[PDB]
Design a protein around this motif. Structure first.
Motif, PDB file in Angstrom:
ATOM      1  N   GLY A 256      14.511  42.843  97.793  1.00 43.01           N
ATOM      2  CA  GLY A 256      15.003  42.957  96.432  1.00 43.01           C
ATOM      3  C   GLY A 256      15.484  44.352  96.088  1.00 43.01           C
ATOM      4  N   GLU A 257      15.713  45.190  97.102  1.00 43.71           N
ATOM      5  CA  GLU A 257      16.101  46.573  96.845  1.00 43.71           C
ATOM      6  C   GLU A 257      17.402  46.663  96.059  1.00 43.71           C
ATOM      7  N   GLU A 258      18.336  45.739  96.296  1.00 43.42           N
ATOM      8  CA  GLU A 258      19.617  45.786  95.602  1.00 43.42           C
ATOM      9  C   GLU A 258      19.452  45.748  94.089  1.00 43.42           C
ATOM     10  N   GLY A 259      18.413  45.081  93.589  1.00 41.33           N
ATOM     11  CA  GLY A 259      18.124  45.036  92.171  1.00 41.33           C
ATOM     12  C   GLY A 259      16.902  45.818  91.746  1.00 41.33           C
TER      13      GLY A 259
END
Lengths: 48, 22
Positions: free
Chosen positions: A17-20
């Protein structure tokens, strides 16, 4: 002999979930500047 | 593919980090 077609091995990969992800935030206090006309201690003297 | 959910208990979710200032 048997064929791995149906029983093939499984690889894995997380759904990251790093992108968010929210970022780490640094705090800085807004110093009441002495460059601006800040007050001073009233060191007192006596005229005797 | 297909999706899976980890059963990792919460107590096992602690991590400690040691490093250098560089």
């Amino acid at each position: 002999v048997r064929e791995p077609g149906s029983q093939a091995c499984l690889a894995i990969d997380p759904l990251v979930g790093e992108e968010g992800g929210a970022a780490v935030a640094k705090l800085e206090p807004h110093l009441q500047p002495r460059g601006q006309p800040a007050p001073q201690p009233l060191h007192t003297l006596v005229l005797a | 593919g297909t999706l899976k959910t980890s059963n990792l208990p919460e107590e096992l979710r602690k991590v400690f980090i040691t490093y250098s200032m560089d």
